[PDB]
Amino acid sequence: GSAAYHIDEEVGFALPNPQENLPDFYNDWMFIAKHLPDLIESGQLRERVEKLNMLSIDHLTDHKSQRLARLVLGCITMAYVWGKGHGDVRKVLPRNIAVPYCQLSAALELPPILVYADCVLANWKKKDPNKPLTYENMDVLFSFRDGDCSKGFFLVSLLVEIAAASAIKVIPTVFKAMQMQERDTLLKALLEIASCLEKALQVFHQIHDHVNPKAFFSVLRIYLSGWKGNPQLSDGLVYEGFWEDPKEFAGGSAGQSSVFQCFDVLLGIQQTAGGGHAAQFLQDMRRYMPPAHRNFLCSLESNPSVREFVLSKGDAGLREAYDACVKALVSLRSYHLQIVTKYILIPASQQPKGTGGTDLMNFLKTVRSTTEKSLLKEG
Numbered sequence: 001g002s003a004a005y006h007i008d009e010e011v012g013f014a015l016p017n018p019q020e021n022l023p024d025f026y027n028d029w030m031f032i033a034k035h036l037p038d039l040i041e042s043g044q045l046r047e048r049v050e051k052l053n054m055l056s057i058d059h060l061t062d063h064k065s066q067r068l069a070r071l072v073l074g075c076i077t078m079a080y081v082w083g084k085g086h087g088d089v090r091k092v093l094p095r096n097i098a099v100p101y102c103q104l105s106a107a108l109e110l111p112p113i114l115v116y117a118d119c120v121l122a123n124w125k126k127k128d129p130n131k132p133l134t135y136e137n138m139d140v141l142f143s144f145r146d147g148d149c150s151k152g153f154f155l156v157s158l159l160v161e162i163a164a165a166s167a168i169k170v171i172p173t174v175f176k177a178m179q180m181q182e183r184d185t186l187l188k189a190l191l192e193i194a195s196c197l198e199k200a201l202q203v204f205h206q207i208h209d210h211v212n213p214k215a216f217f218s219v220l221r222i223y224l225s226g227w228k229g230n231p232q233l234s235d236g237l238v239y240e241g242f243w244e245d246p247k248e249f250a251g252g253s254a255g256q257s258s259v260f261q262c263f264d265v266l267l268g269i270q271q272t273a274g275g276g277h278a279a280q281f282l283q284d285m286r287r288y289m290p291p292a293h294r295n296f297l298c299s300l301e302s303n304p305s306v307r308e309f310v311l312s313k314g315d316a317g318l319r320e321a322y323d324a325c326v327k328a329l330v331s332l333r334s335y336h337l338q339i340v341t342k343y344i345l346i347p348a349s350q351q352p353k354g355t356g357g358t359d360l361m362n363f364l365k366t367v368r369s370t371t372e373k374s375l376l377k378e379g
């Protein structure tokens, strides 16, 4: 929960109180991003992007301004590449978006595609500043199409992140209690983490109230899709004026959250490097996370193993508190598998991920079972 790693005590990995407006200099960008439903529907989005002048990034003078600009340019990019979302794609992102988008992304150490830390961690607003972080008091900054359920998908992801924050802020307490040899403190800390994680599973149920499977699978998913192993942009995307040859970048999204990995590493659940395929996907998604949060995960992996400390103590109270965290992480990913069945697998069966969810489910079920196989029980 330390603020050397851009981790907020209240909202966790989410960007605390994100910026809503840019300097007047960028009005031309702001207008397009704010009006994607109209501009896409009316078929004028591509023209508006192609007729932008090149705006410098030097007038973006702080981190929150850069994050808003990244979110703005990534939303335009995604809208430009996929158009109305029915196969009329563009394989060259015009110079006057691509160069500033790519400079800004190098400064922020993120890939120049829309990622979770844009469309979720930075894409939100309090309606009334003085009321709490509840769904009915929040809004997103940007959507793609009327009916795309972006508000429901993004905010319910956000609210799960905010829930996780109360378990994340406990993490220093764990390592300190280990280092100071405080058995009761360590046990309290572990139960508190599990309780908060169980809370976050409850918050996850809201997704059904605010996202409709046909909308997500058939609309929002299109705009979160990228160009890594995508037959529609077989060779990646040309960032005109910045790199000569195209580059592939994964249209991740939901799966770029650091929350599950945060607790995987805490609980020494060797999963990041413990195998072949699934461990490779999990490592690749780290490049799509903010750098400060990439560093957090590493500095957690370098610490004394909590799972070893608990194993070494001959202490059933400790082992049971540790297992409550592992169970809440299993529960969360189990529920997540159901969510993916409702919102990806079933709609693909009707008409299409593309009936290629067998590999999807297998990747999710592997990670779940490896989490479950970390339960300690009597040993």
Ligand code: HEM
Residues within 6 Å of the ligand: 156, 157, 160, 204, 207, 216, 252, 253, 254, 255, 256, 257, 258, 259, 260, 261, 333, 336, 339, 340, 343, 344, 360, 364, 367, 368
């Ligand atoms: C609401 C909060 C959500 C969180 C916190 C979350 C988090 C994650 C995480 C951590 C992974 C990596 C796998 C793992 O560690 O077990 C993942 C993968 C994935 N998630 Fe989610 N997810 C959420 C919602 C959703 C929803 C609603 C969908 C789809 C409708 C979804 C679709 C996927 C898919 C398809 C993958 C596989 C990786 C990929 O193809 O990019 N997630 N998610």
